[PDB]
Design a protein around this ligand. Structure first.
Ligand code: NA
Ligand code: NA
Lengths: 412, 416
């Protein structure tokens, strides 16, 4: 049961061990725990939040151990809040790790920490609550800000409960028939004015599902809202935190008829079909499929209304989830974004790399929007979404299609 | 219900793991162990997958399948997900249903992510027939020998069955060429030097051994490794697998071999792969070392010596049981129904329950070293870094009545 000898970061390194940060990911990502506090995690630290443990079965934990290459007898040094450290210690002990210490000097040198380059784009609930209350917070919006729930269709679960002061966006306001591509620049301008968004309004989006808010978020970035943020993990994190809620219909919003710049200010953030096709078979560019494996291999289209099966020939698999409405490969057990290191490694194995021009697509753009926001938070400088995705590509039977089981080599 | 016909829904590995289910790899063990099905393709199995090859099924009775199911603790109702080719998955699915498993799915994303696969760290040391045939015929193969290579059949005595048939281009080595009376220990370094030269083997010749019995070839292989042949391999499951694959064969006496008088390194280049009695005794009563008995349970408890010409009964005191087989000449505990090496995960668990672990200095012995060489070759392929054979085994140990002897039913605690 007892911990082994405490180790400094230097000693752990000399012993080829690994540091495990037991704090929630928000903090691992770069959010300081208190104002002006240390930002980020120790060099090469893994993230295993004590708060995830009740949603990790024995086999999930075993898989996480293997996937992070924890050798059975190599030292692991835990840090963070003392209850969390103890809870993680116990699980790792049951999982059969044999040399568990605390990292004694964890977080003591702010200048050697690593962070998500734009962690401030993935907010967490306590921070949003403190912002609302007028408490001084890290990376405060520069001016006006708005919080907005996004979902498909008329307000429904929002009427039962929502984040206080939250406006509501029906996804149908930003996308439509016949392709489920974004609506016109003109329609986006009307939409932005109506919800009182100017180019310098910070917009904080959340949803029951992260991908609905990400979809709206990426479109607003395209249109020209400079500061657009997501609630990491979506509404569930706010619910689980037991923060206050409001109910009923969205309150009247004051229109902002002058956006302040020409829409679209960032047109390069969205590719069309020919542009997407132009990325294929290149070392310096990647067209990334954010589709489930059965979609990628052609077992299923993933969608009721899409008849053709298969994938974009030359698309590099970026992973996704179990079907077209889930994103498990990008999520911690609490629904927040997996560690940037992990996402980076998963993408690298498929030759998808930050120096490339990278464009994500899926069935119609939702899952791709989610990975786009993460890539942006990760500091990836040339990312975009190919809106039309498989629905568009496969509408033309001349377009090259791949099917069957294959690996990274097959998308050179 | 018993007429029920819906397919259990496919599961991702993430899903199987959420539910603490079991994956079952229906491929032949060579691919389970890590051999890729295509040059540069995925290598190995999904984490903690079991191996139940479709090709074993016609050699597994109802009782054997039931014992296998129970040994791997497949709960009647817990999710089981299969993968492999369609014909194999279906054959295995049908047998598992007839044994009464009820929640049987396909693992829909099996092998889709090479980096999470598990394999023998040196799967290439345990070759399989199609690989060798392809090598012979100038095809591209995984883990190709670096330079010259030789295939060699090993068996006790002069060429018998070898004259009826053998692998094409196989030479033949009588085990009497590597070991002899009075102890049945390896012959001297000088005689090994002559043995190697006469068989055309230099330190950088890849040697591929097989026998009608795996342990004959393992015996010769481990001695060659000790001498300093760097790349030594076994045909997994021995001659029988080549015969069952229906591959071409050759007949008659062993062709002449070009002598190779210069070995190229001092023999022995790896002396630490063989222990003497004193070195073996030095492993006893340790947490960081094990002296491992690869003998049948009746040998281990003193019911029988296991041998005609060995009178004392019992076991080296403090030795740890590493399993073996039903009697002194079989190895069921290390074999699949096709004769190939049983799963590394199972062998690892079986050793661990007797406090035999990869972190230890580990030395295997038996009566005279044959079975021990077999397990040595497996632990080597499993990537165990400090393993050896204690050549003299029970025959040498018990020849001196002063050496302490253990007897009777006992567990791992009696070997601390
Ligand atoms: Na679209
Ligand atoms: Na011997």
């Amino acid at each position: 049961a007892e911990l082994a000898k405490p180790l400094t970061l230097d000693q752990l390194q000399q012993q080829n061990g690994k540091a495990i940060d037991t704090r929630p990911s928000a903090f691992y990502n770069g959010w300081p725990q208190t104002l002006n506090g240390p930002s980020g995690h120790e060099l090469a630290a893994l993230n295993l939040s004590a708060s995830w443990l009740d949603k990790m079965s024995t086999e999930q934990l075993n898989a996480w151990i293997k996937q992070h290459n924890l050798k059975t007898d190599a030292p692991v040094a835990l840090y963070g809040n003392d209850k969390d450290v103890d809870a993680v210690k116990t699980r790792l002990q049951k999982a059969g790790l044999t040399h568990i210490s605390i990292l004694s000097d964890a977080l003591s040198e702010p200048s050697r920490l690593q962070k998500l380059p734009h962690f401030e784009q993935l907010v967490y609930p306590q921070w949003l609550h403190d912002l609302q209350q007028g408490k001084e917070v890290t990376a405060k919006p520069a001016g006006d800000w708005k919080v907005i729930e996004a979902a498909w269709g008329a307000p429904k679960l929002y009427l039962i409960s929502h984040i206080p002061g939250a406006d509501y966006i029906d996804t149908n306001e930003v996308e439509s028939e016949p392709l489920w591509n974004k609506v016109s620049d003109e329609q986006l301008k009307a939409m932005l004015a109506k919800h009182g968004i100017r180019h310098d309004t910070t917009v904080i989006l959340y949803g029951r599902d992260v991908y609905a808010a990400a979809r709206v978020a990426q479109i607003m970035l395209y249109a020209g809202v400079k500061d657009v943020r997501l609630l990491d993990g979506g509404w569930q994190t706010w619910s689980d935190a037991g923060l206050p809620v409001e109910r009923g219909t969205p309150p009247k919003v004051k229109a902002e008829p002058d956006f302040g710049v020409k829409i679209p200010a960032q047109p390069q953030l969205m590719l069309d079909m020919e542009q997407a096709r132009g990325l294929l078979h290149r070392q310096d560019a990647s067209l990334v499929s954010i589709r489930s494996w059965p979609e990628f291999i052609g077992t299923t289209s993933g969608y009721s209304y899409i008849k053709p099966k298969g994938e974009i020939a030359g698309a590099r698999w970026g992973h996704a989830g179990s079907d077209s409405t889930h994103m498990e490969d990008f999520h911690n057990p609490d629904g927040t974004m997996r560690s940037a290191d992990d996402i980076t490694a998963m993408w690298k194995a498929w030759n998808i790399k930050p120096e490339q021009q990278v464009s994500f697509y899926c069935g119609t753009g939702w899952r791709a929007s989610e990975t786009f926001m993460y890539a942006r938070a990760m500091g990836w400088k040339n990312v975009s979404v190919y809106d039309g995705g498989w629905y568009e590509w496969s509408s033309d039977p001349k377009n090259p299609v791949a099917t069957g089981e294959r690996g990274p080599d097959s998308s050179k």
